[PDB]
C-alpha cells in the first residue's frame, strides 16, 4: 500500500531541491506503513478466516469489509457451493440454508481502497512533516518567535486524527 510517494510530497511541499534527503524518504516509507496499519487494514491479498457458526444464525461478517469475492468456503471440512449463499457489500455473507453447528473456514480476496482518497494523501503528508520538523514537542522559542503545539490524542496530533477516524475501521 502506497498512499504517497516522493512526487506527491514534492507537490505538496513545493520542493525544488533536486532530491529528497534519506530522512524524508525513510519517513515517507514509514508513514505509508503506519497509516496502513492504524486504519486496521492490512496489505495481504488472500485471507483465510475461521468462524464459529450455529444453525440459528445465517448472516456472517467477513473480517475485512473490502472483501471482494469468496473463493472457498467449507463447514466441518464439508464443502458447500456458491448457490448456497449470497455475498453482499461490506463483506456480508447470507446463507441460504441453516448451517450445521461448528466451524466454518473461508478464503477470500480482500482488495482495498481504489483510488486512494485525497484526504488520506494529505494526512500522510502532514504526518511526514510532523516527524520531519520534529514537532513532537509542547513548545519552542528559538530566537524571538514562539509556538505551542496541539493537544495530541492517542499520541497522534489532533489535526491529523480526525481524518484517520473518518476512515478508522471498526
Amino acid at each position: 500500500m502506497q498512499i504517497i510517494t516522493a512526487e506527491d510530497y514534492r507537490l505538496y511541499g513545493g520542493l525544488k531541491r533536486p532530491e529528497l534527503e534519506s530522512g524524508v524518504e525513510m519517513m515517507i516509507t514509514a508513514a505509508n506503513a503506519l497509516i496502513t496499519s492504524l486504519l486496521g487494514m492490512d496489505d495481504a491479498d488472500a485471507v483465510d478466516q475461521l468462524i464459529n457458526t450455529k444453525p440459528t444464525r445465517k448472516k456472517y461478517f467477513l473480517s475485512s469489509p473490502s472483501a471482494t469475492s469468496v473463493t472457498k468456503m467449507t463447514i466441518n471440512d464439508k464443502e458447500i457451493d456458491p448457490e448456497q449463499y449470497k455475498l453482499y457489500s461490506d463483506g456480508v455473507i447470507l446463507l441460504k440454508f441453516s448451517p450445521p453447528e461448528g466451524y466454518m473456514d473461508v478464503e477470500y480476496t480482500q482488495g482495498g481502497f481504489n483510488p486512494i482518497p485525497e484526504d488520506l494523501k494529505l494526512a500522510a503528508c502532514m504526518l511526514v512533516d510532523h516527524w520531519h520538523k520534529q514537532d513532537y514537542r509542547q513548545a519552542k522559542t528559538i530566537g524571538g518567535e514562539t509556538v505551542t503545539f496541539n493537544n495530541t490524542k492517542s499520541g497522534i496530533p489532533e489535526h491529523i486524527r480526525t481524518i484517520i477516524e473518518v476512515y478508522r475501521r471498526v
Partner: protein, 101 residues
C-alpha cells in the same frame, strides 16, 4: 456481556480479536482453568451494569387473568382444568353440567 476492557491507545485489530478469543475460552470454568487477570500498559476495566433485566417482565398474573377470561366465557370451572380434591371434583361436574349445558 461478561467483561469490558478499555484503552486510549489504538491496538492492532487482528491481535485484539485473538486476545478476546483467548480470554473468552480461558476464563470460563467449563472451557478453561485460569481466573486471575493481570492488566498492563494501561488497559482499564470498566464497571458496568445490566441496564435492562428480564426480572421486570413479571407477566405471570396478567396472562393468568386472560386465561381466566377465556375459561369463564365458556363457563367451565377451573377445578375441571386442574383437578382438585374429591369434595371439589364431584360437585363441580354437576355445576358444569346443570348451569352451562
Amino acid at each position: 456481556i461478561g467483561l469490558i476492557l478499555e484503552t486510549d491507545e489504538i491496538l492492532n485489530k487482528k491481535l485484539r480479536e485473538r486476545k478476546q478469543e483467548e480470554l473468552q475460552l480461558d476464563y470460563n470454568p467449563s472451557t478453561g482453568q485460569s481466573s486471575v487477570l493481570i492488566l498492563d500498559g494501561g488497559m482499564k476495566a470498566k464497571p458496568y451494569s445490566q441496564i435492562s433485566s428480564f426480572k421486570d417482565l413479571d407477566f405471570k398474573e396478567d396472562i393468568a387473568g386472560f386465561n381466566k377470561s377465556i375459561c369463564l366465557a365458556f363457563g367451565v370451572p377451573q377445578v375441571l382444568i386442574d383437578g382438585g380434591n374429591n369434595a371439589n371434583i364431584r360437585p363441580n361436574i354437576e355445576l358444569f353440567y346443570y348451569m352451562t349445558i
